[PDB]
Design a protein around this nucleic acid. Structure first.
Ligand SMILES: [Mg+2]
Ligand SMILES: [Mg+2]
Ligand SMILES: [Mg+2]
Ligand SMILES: [Mg+2]
Ligand SMILES: [Mg+2]
Ligand SMILES: [Mg+2]
Ligand SMILES: [Mg+2]
Ligand SMILES: [Mg+2]
Ligand SMILES: [Mg+2]
Ligand SMILES: [Mg+2]
Ligand SMILES: [Mg+2]
Ligand SMILES: [Mg+2]
Ligand SMILES: [Mg+2]
Ligand SMILES: [Mg+2]
Ligand SMILES: [Mg+2]
Ligand SMILES: [Mg+2]
Ligand SMILES: [Mg+2]
Ligand SMILES: [Mg+2]
Ligand SMILES: [Mg+2]
Ligand SMILES: [Zn+2]
Lengths: 99, 49, 137, 122, 97, 56, 86, 58
RNA sequence: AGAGUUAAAUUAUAACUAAGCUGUAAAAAGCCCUAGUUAAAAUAAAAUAACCCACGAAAGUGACUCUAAUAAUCCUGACACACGAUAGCUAGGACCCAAACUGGGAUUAGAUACCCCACUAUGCCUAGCCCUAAACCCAAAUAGUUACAUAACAAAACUA
């Protein structure tokens, strides 16, 4: 049997380390009129704006490239016992699985 | 080391003999302490103009 | 078309002229805009008073001269006398914060004076003389 | 250098400036102070019209004299310079090189203050 | 018994702290050109921390140096010297919009 | 009252070798004449502790 | 007074535009805080009132900055809901 | 940035004299203030002045 | 705590111009030895920096320079000793400005109040007193804990 610590040590998320400026392939699972919900796969899904070029090439299930900025947007404010999670990650759109 | 360093600077001190020469050379060698700074934190000296 | 809002100090060598005269020789217009009155005095560069006009000098009254229309009229009244002595450009120096602050400045243009610059010389003490006590005890 | 005099001499001719500097340095030496260096910062325009010795001064020559003096002779030199009609505004300060530069660590991220109020439901 | 357990070590991804524009510098009262970069060109007001962006020590040192220079007679109080008006902008305040 | 001479060669430069061979300018600079009140306080403290105490 | 004139708080008009130059000068004064200081110095304020005003202004500034920060943080969630009707 | 709040309020753990004395607790509410309506002012005053300038002279 | 200095404003003081200036929601009174610009000593206070939170036991302190200097190898502890914001007293000095009181002008049935004007003690320096404050951060000092546990509000509940 394999232990949770052993698998977590070799997990790709552990290998990534910090989530600042990391290239991640994410697959879009939901489509809005102008917003794309890209699931980079870590914890949450990031919402991005459809670019002007190759706009029709972004469909459901399409895999794209992102530069991850924040794994989860949480912040504290005045008189807050806990943080206010946004249930979303921050990332930018660069390309769509160049190959 | 402090004493040794101060011995070197004791040679260039202004005395009675060197008063006339020091005043004349100061009146002919102007000095400026002006220097600006940049957003990146780099020192720029206006002496290039 | 590189234009700078900073004044043309005499220490520089820039070539800016108004009606053939340099920025230093252009006459001055001191506009003291108080809370109850607005006074305008147009003087030459040599500090020689050329024209003088206040809201009270135009036949107004106690509360009448404190409005912006009184300052606008006083601007035209001062501009007419300034033009009568041959003045085409003037540097406006504003003194004090009052209701007739911009009104006099625009009244000068209405009366026929071309403003090249607006200087705000408002007396702000560095915690000097103690002002009067507050109202509505 | 221990003390630094920021001498502001009246804008005059070269021989007069030299004589004024000579007598000022002699006065500094008479008080029991050895002079390290004298640097001329040049004759500039005064930021404001300084009125001194019943005279309105618009220009002036800047000089910087660094020296070592006892703590008791500072006011005596200040008094001597106050009565000199060729000095616009004399000032003796501590030399900036005496204070060693401290490690500017930078901005330390200060977290927002919590637990300032009770957890009672509003 | 487990070797893959995490070890209580210091964070290797510790990003260095940001430095002020004058971090590890020497603030002086005679470099009026340097001192003028933090004052308002129109009124001579000293800009605050939210404008200058200097970590605590240097803001106070700049304020003290400016106050010393303005009374010693090296830098004007009412306005900024136009000779230093062309200095590069380090402040984060924009007047003309 | 104690009378520390102005040329006492304060303790910060007193216990170093080759201090008496230096010139009068450096000796005067390192002496108590150019020193503040703190150096005289240190000199008086050491002088009193050397003569009153048994284990300085 | 002792300083040189026509240097401080002076703006040069452009192409005869005076109303805009006056607005520029007013913005200069407002950003430098001179308008508020002039309006405050008309009548003397006691130190207790000055301290109360400073504390109130600091608290208001803190609250406004935090509210603006939260609004900017939550601006993302203003998009149309993709799971309507679930 | 946000002004510092450490050591400002009067608390048992704070050893120094309090700096800020809030009128109301510094708790971020769940609703922003309503936009205030601008106060109106008289208009066309400068044009009424030049209109009456005709009458005063004619 | 001493010694020295003044950037802005204001004023005693002169010159040119002009007739009002100041005054409020509106007026009246007052000054027209008035108002604006240009120069200007002395006194008082110390814009922005300060969205900083430091120093001091507290009161209190943030215009600049210099000297002296901020106890305790650090528990609590008086009726004992030393300080003690503003206000007031005594003697000497200064007095730009503000202002108790006062005298006028408004409003009111009345206004010995709020509003405007002028001015005094006083606020300013030295010495000597007086020893009071919502002197409150209404939370005693010394070393601690987040265990049990919300009368209510407020700055959470507690140990030796
Ligand atoms: Mg009351
Ligand atoms: Mg303390
Ligand atoms: Mg309350
Ligand atoms: Mg004293
Ligand atoms: Mg002055
Ligand atoms: Mg007098
Ligand atoms: Mg009357
Ligand atoms: Mg000040
Ligand atoms: Mg101690
Ligand atoms: Mg005890
Ligand atoms: Mg008293
Ligand atoms: Mg009096
Ligand atoms: Mg009065
Ligand atoms: Mg009465
Ligand atoms: Mg007392
Ligand atoms: Mg108190
Ligand atoms: Mg009590
Ligand atoms: Mg006790
Ligand atoms: Mg209940
Ligand atoms: Zn720094």
């Amino acid at each position: 049997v394999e232990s949770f610590a052993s698998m977590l040590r070799h997990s790709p998320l552990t290998q990534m380390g910090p989530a600042k400026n990391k290239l991640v392939i994410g697959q879009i699972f939901h489509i809005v009129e102008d917003d794309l919900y890209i699931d980079f796969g870590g914890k949450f899904h990031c919402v991005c704006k459809r670019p002007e070029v190759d706009g029709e090439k972004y469909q459901k299930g399409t895999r794209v490239r992102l530069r991850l900025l924040d794994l989860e947007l949480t912040s504290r404010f005045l008189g807050a016992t806990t943080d206010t999670t946004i249930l979303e990650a921050d990332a930018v759109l660069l390309g769509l699985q160049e190959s | 080391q402090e004493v040794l360093q101060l011995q070197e600077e004791a040679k260039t001190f202004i005395t009675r003999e060197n008063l006339e020469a020091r005043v004349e050379e100061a009146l002919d060698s102007p000095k400026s302490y002006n220097w600006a700074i940049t957003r990146e934190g780099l020192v720029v000296r206006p002496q290039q103009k | 078309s590189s234009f700078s809002i900073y004044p043309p100090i005499p220490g520089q060598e820039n070539s800016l002229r108004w009606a053939g005269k340099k920025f230093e020789e252009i006459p001055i217009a001191h506009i003291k805009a108080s809370y109850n009155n607005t006074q305008i005095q147009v003087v030459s560069a040599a500090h020689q008073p050329l024209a003088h006009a206040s809201c009270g000098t135009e036949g107004f009254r106690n509360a009448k001269k404190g409005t912006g229309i009184a300052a606008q009229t006083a601007g035209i009244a001062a501009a007419a006398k300034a033009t009568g002595k041959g003045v085409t450009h003037v540097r406006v120096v504003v003194k004090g914060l009052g209701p007739g602050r911009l009104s006099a400045i625009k009244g000068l243009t209405m009366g026929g004076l071309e403003v090249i610059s607006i200087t705000d010389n408002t007396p702000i003490p560095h915690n000097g003389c103690r002002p009067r006590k507050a109202r509505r005890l | 250098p221990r003390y630094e005099l920021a001498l502001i001499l009246k804008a005059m001719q070269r021989p007069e400036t030299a004589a004024a500097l000579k007598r000022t340095l002699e006065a500094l030496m008479d008080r029991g102070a050895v002079v390290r260096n004298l640097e001329n910062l040049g004759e500039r325009m005064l930021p404001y019209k300084i009125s001194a010795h019943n005279q309105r001064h618009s220009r002036g020559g800047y000089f910087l004299v660094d020296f070592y003096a006892p703590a008791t002779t500072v006011e005596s030199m200040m008094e001597h310079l106050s009565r000199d009609i060729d000095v616009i505004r004399p000032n003796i300060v501590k030399h900036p090189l005496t204070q060693e530069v401290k490690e500017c660590e930078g901005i330390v991220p200060v977290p927002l203050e919590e637990k300032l109020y009770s957890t009672k439901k509003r | 018994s487990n070797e893959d357990l995490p070890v209580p070590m210091e964070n290797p991804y510790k990003e260095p702290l940001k430095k002020c524009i004058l971090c590890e510098k020497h603030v002086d009262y005679k470099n009026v050109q340097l001192l003028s970069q933090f004052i308002s060109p129109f009124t001579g007001c000293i800009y605050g921390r939210h404008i200058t962006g200097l970590c605590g020590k240097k803001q106070k040192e700049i304020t003290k140096a400016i106050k010393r220079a303005q009374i010693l007679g090296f830098m004007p109080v009412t306005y900024k010297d136009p000779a230093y008006l062309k200095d590069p902008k380090v402040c984060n305040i924009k007047y003309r919009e | 009252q104690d009378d520390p001479p102005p040329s006492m060669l304060l303790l910060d430069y007193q216990n170093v070798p080759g201090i008496h061979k230096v010139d009068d300018v450096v000796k005067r600079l390192l002496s108590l004449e150019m020193a503040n009140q703190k150096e005289k306080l240190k000199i008086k403290k050491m002088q009193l502790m050397n003569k009153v105490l048994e284990n300085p | 007074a002792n300083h040189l004139k026509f240097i401080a708080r002076t703006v040069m008009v452009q192409e005869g535009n005076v109303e805009g130059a006056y607005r520029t000068l007013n913005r200069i004064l407002t950003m430098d805080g001179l308008i508020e200081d002039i309006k405050r110095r008309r009548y003397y304020e006691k130190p207790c009132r000055r301290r109360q005003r400073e504390s109130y202004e600091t608290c208001r500034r803190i609250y406004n900055m935090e509210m603006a920060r939260k609004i900017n943080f939550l601006m993302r969630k203003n998009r149309a809901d993709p799971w309507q009707g679930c | 940035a946000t002004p510092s709040l450490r050591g400002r309020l009067a608390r048992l753990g704070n050893p120094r004299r309090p700096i800020l004395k809030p009128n109301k607790p510094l708790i971020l509410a769940n609703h922003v203030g309503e936009r205030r309506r601008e106060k109106g002012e008289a208009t066309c005053i400068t044009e009424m002045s030049v209109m009456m300038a005709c009458w005063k002279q004619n």
